[PDB]
């Protein structure tokens, strides 16, 4: 149960580029860096899994959600 300022610092790790959203490409980079080589399809699966609103990307509120466990 991190605090809101705690979860935003972590969020910024994923959100490499400017904008406050995590794209599939930024997620593929994080995963490769953290030891997991994944396909475009696996990456799409992870983004879908977290993409509540269905816009193709993970925003801040959606991040806050599942980073529960």
């Amino acid at each position: 149960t991190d605090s809101e300022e705690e979860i935003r610092e972590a969020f910024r790790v994923f959100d490499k580029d400017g904008n406050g959203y995590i794209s599939a490409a930024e997620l593929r980079h994080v995963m490769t860096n953290l030891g997991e080589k994944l396909t475009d399809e696996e990456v799409d699966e992870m983004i879908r899994e977290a993409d509540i609103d269905g816009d193709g990307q993970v925003n801040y509120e959606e991040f806050v959600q599942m980073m529960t466990a």
């Binding site: 991190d2 809101e4 300022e5 705690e6 935003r8 610092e9 972590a10 969020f11 910024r12 790790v13 994923f14 959100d15 490499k16 580029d17 400017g18 904008n19 406050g20 997620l27 980079h29 994080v30 995963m31 860096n33 953290l34 030891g35 997991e36 994944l38 696996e42 699966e45 992870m46 899994e49 977290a50 801040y60 509120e61 806050v64 599942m66 980073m67 466990a69």
Partner: protein, 351 residues
Amino acid sequence: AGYANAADRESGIPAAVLDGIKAVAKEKNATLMFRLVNPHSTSLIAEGVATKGLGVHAKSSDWGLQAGYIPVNPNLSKLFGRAPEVIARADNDVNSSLAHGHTAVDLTLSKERLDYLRQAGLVTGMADGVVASNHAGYEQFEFRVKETSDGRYAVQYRRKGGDDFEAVKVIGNAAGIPLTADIDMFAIMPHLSNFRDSARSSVTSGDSVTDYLARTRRALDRERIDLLWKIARAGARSAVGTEARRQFRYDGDMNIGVITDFELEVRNALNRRAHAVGAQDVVQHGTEQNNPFPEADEKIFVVSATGESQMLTRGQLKEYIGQQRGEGYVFYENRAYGVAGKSLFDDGLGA
């Protein structure tokens, strides 16, 4: 190689020490940013003078033969003709330091430093050892020095037409090694790959996701995707040292400030190189991104993970950080930068 450009030379960091900094930054694949080191400290640091921790609030001196050191007599420090009410605020600072491991010590300079001082214009010749200076601090105090069959000179002084001389006292290590300023890191931008093992020891066991699943599960995979997000969460959480920044860390009996695990590694790796080159610990605490009293100097010395050095204005610093993040280097900012309208981030910045 030593200094490779102007930046390095304006950094105030001794060359040998800087060589280690560039090597560490490459070994740990991390960009290291530092606040400028006062040039009067650069030479003390290299001949091995000790560096001060946060347990020392007394103020340094910028004049006389004592420049670069921290005087017990605040009238000898940068606070010369202040208010009597500040020599007091200053008097206490010093006292809080001697009650706690920090010692009182007779200032003695090396020959070389005596050169540096004279060549710097801080000390204007002397009698054959009776210094002169145009610092207002000389219109009230009288100075002189007496060498020793040790090659070092003992600094001594007295109050204007007010009679015996006496060795100037400076705050030293618990070990009595005198202290000069330390090298304040502005921040550390670790490349994200430095946290793979950290995320694995937290989520899997140390194992890759593929290995972990084969091992604990049995012959679209909801499980596998969840576990992938789990190491992603754990990776950033380690990278940003969320948990570690909740407490203070201590080095023996020295409060090290708030510092992440990786930042502690860097610190240790840096001080190791400093020792190998004749210096003592040069980084004594955490990064400015965790300093509650955020200071706003406007030039920052930067050493990239590739070894390249440069100076940066706050503005070139934003774009630099942005460029660096694009390459996978993680960065988090001092928590109080936003509320003052000085955040280096151009994102929503919120929830």
